[PDB]
Amino acid sequence: VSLMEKLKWKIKCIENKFLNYRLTTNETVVAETEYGKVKGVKRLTVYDDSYYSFEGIPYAQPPVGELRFKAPQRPTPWDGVRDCCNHKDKSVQVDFITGKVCGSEDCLYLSVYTNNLNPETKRPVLVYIHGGGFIIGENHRDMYGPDYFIKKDVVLINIQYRLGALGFLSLNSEDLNVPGNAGLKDQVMALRWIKNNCANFGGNPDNITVFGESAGAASTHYMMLTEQTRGLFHRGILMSGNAICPWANTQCQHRAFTLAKLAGYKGEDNDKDVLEFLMKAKPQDLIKLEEKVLTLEERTNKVMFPFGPTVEPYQTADCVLPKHPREMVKTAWGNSIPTMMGNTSYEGLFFTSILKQMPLLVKELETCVNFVPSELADAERTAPETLEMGAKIKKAHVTGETPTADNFMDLCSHFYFWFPMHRLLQLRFNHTSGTPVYLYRFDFDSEDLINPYRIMRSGRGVKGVSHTDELTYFFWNQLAKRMPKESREYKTIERMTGIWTQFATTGNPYSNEIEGMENVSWDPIEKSDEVYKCLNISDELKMIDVPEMGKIKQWESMFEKHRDLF
Numbered sequence: 001v002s003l004m005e006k007l008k009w010k011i012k013c014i015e016n017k018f019l020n021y022r023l024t025t026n027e028t029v030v031a032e033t034e035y036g037k038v039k040g041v042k043r044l045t046v047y048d049d050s051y052y053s054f055e056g057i058p059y060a061q062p063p064v065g066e067l068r069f070k071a072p073q074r075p076t077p078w079d080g081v082r083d084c085c086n087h088k089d090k091s092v093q094v095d096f097i098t099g100k101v102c103g104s105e106d107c108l109y110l111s112v113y114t115n116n117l118n119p120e121t122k123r124p125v126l127v128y129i130h131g132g133g134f135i136i137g138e139n140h141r142d143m144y145g146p147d148y149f150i151k152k153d154v155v156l157i158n159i160q161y162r163l164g165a166l167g168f169l170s171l172n173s174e175d176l177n178v179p180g181n182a183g184l185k186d187q188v189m190a191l192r193w194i195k196n197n198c199a200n201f202g203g204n205p206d207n208i209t210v211f212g213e214s215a216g217a218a219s220t221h222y223m224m225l226t227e228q229t230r231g232l233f234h235r236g237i238l239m240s241g242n243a244i245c246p247w248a249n250t251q252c253q254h255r256a257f258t259l260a261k262l263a264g265y266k267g268e269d270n271d272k273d274v275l276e277f278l279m280k281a282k283p284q285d286l287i288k289l290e291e292k293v294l295t296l297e298e299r300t301n302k303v304m305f306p307f308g309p310t311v312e313p314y315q316t317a318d319c320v321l322p323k324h325p326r327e328m329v330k331t332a333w334g335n336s337i338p339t340m341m342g343n344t345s346y347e348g349l350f351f352t353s354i355l356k357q358m359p360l361l362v363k364e365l366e367t368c369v370n371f372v373p374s375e376l377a378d379a380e381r382t383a384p385e386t387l388e389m390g391a392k393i394k395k396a397h398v399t400g401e402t403p404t405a406d407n408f409m410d411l412c413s414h415f416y417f418w419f420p421m422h423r424l425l426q427l428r429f430n431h432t433s434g435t436p437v438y439l440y441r442f443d444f445d446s447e448d449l450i451n452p453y454r455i456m457r458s459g460r461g462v463k464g465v466s467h468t469d470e471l472t473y474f475f476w477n478q479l480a481k482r483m484p485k486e487s488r489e490y491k492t493i494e495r496m497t498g499i500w501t502q503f504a505t506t507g508n509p510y511s512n513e514i515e516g517m518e519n520v521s522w523d524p525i526e527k528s529d530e531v532y533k534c535l536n537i538s539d540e541l542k543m544i545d546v547p548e549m550g551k552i553k554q555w556e557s558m559f560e561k562h563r564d565l566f
């Protein structure tokens with residue numbers, strides 16, 4: 001991040017400091033949990049609303065020492081009152097604007113927010129799982145503030161979970177009980193806590209909605225796939241992602257050895273000796289090396305992260321992913337609850353800056369071999385069958401004689417988001433009770449109100465709606481400002497939280513309670529639909545045919561002789 005954008009960051013950190021003090025009240029309150037009492041506090045918003053806030057509630061033992069890389073264990077109860085008015089740590093990660101290694105192994109916490117701890121009618125419970133590539137993120141209110149949702153009559157809960165190699169190391173050897181996915185097992189323990197305890201905060205344990213964006217959407221989808229969570233919640237919203245996305249899972253069992261080597265391990269490629277070495281490592285020294293783990297070939301083949309959700313090499317009682325996600329969709333309990341999914345209208349615009357760090361990325365479009373779905377090709381990307389499928393991708397996105405950055409970003413929208421969603425939709429229609437799935441397309445462009453993902457990416461002053469731009473209208477963050485009620489941004493906040501809150505309440509939106517009257521006819525998607533309809537969310541709300549449909553069909557054609565893999 002430019003020096004200028006780091007100073008501006010610095011000034012705003014110091015002012016969210018002054019400001020959140022101003023917004024704290026002296027109305028402390030105590031809620032009782034299965035593990036002990038917790039002391040929370042009323043906070044105000046800049047819109048002059050109020051909510052009760054409980055931060056830093058443990059849902060698992062601090063995964064330290066011999067618990068490193070292992071499945072979470074339940075936390076230690078307590079007999080007094082636990083001080084839950086300050087956030088705790090975020091999971092160890094590289095600070096995405098500062099470049100410093102930050103955070104703590106002691107990160108397994110959640111936060112609960114509601115505008116009224118005493119309704120006579122328990123409320124819909126919304127659980128947000130943050131994204132961040134499974135490598136960054138937090139539940140701190142300076143990125144994920146509940147100030148907009150607590151206008152609504154909901155309980156909102158923001159969880160943390162382990163990130164990076166500390167969350168997703170995976171080793172083949174069954175002796176060692178590091179099968180992988182510890183971070184998803186964290187999410188499972190958190191959802192079980194929520195199911196068990198949300199009543200003590202006015203929630204309805206029989207009306208929980210899980211939602212997340214990007215890696216949090218893949219997470220929500222995994223929580224809908226695994227038997228570990230069967231019937232723990234009742235609606236899901238997948239915002240720009242799902243578990244079939246190529247970036248959402250990796251067979252990373254060999255990269256523990258690579259990480260150890262990069263940290264100075266000397267010895268054999270032997271799971272035991274490698275784990276012995278990684279167990280004694282200073283935790284920041286591992287996270288600051290995770291950017292050097294992927295080999296150039298892997299980065300060629302479009303592997304995005306070295307450690308992530310994986311298919312677990314053997315069975316344990318805690319196993320979350322026993323099989324590949326398309327295989328899990330077959331028997332998934334979550335296929336049979338109301339679901340909403342969507343993307344933005346120019347997802348791949350997120351990669352603008354990065355084509356400036358490597359502008360010979362564009363030349364990847366000359367054959368497009370590197371974007372062919374991995375299951376259909378080999379690592380080195382030479383084969384003649386990879387070339388023919390690369391040619392159909394190229395037809396779908398290159399729009400003249402020379403490939404362009406614009407074309408590259410359009411392709412990314414499909415490679416990373418729209419095509420995975422289509423595959424999921426079609427696979428799910430064959431393993432579902434028949435409950436509805438609704439589609440949205442977020443297409444509202446405003447840069448008077450932004451969020452920090454725009455800073456990490458150098459995305460200021462760039463027209464169109466990138467991956468992550470929607471988050472601004474759901475969550476308060478420290479770059480936000482009180483907007484006027486008349487403003488297009490304010491009305492979009494009200495629209496988005498209104499729709500999400502309505503869906504959480506009955507599994508459908510029409511919550512005519514809106515500014516956005518109702519010429520909207522928002523049908524779910526049917527099986528014999530050859531074209532998907534979506535609510536396009538701009539200054540207007542209007543149902544349209546997904547403009548991306550034609551390219552989605554061109555990508556599907558790659559499976560014409562491999563339909564069992566689509």
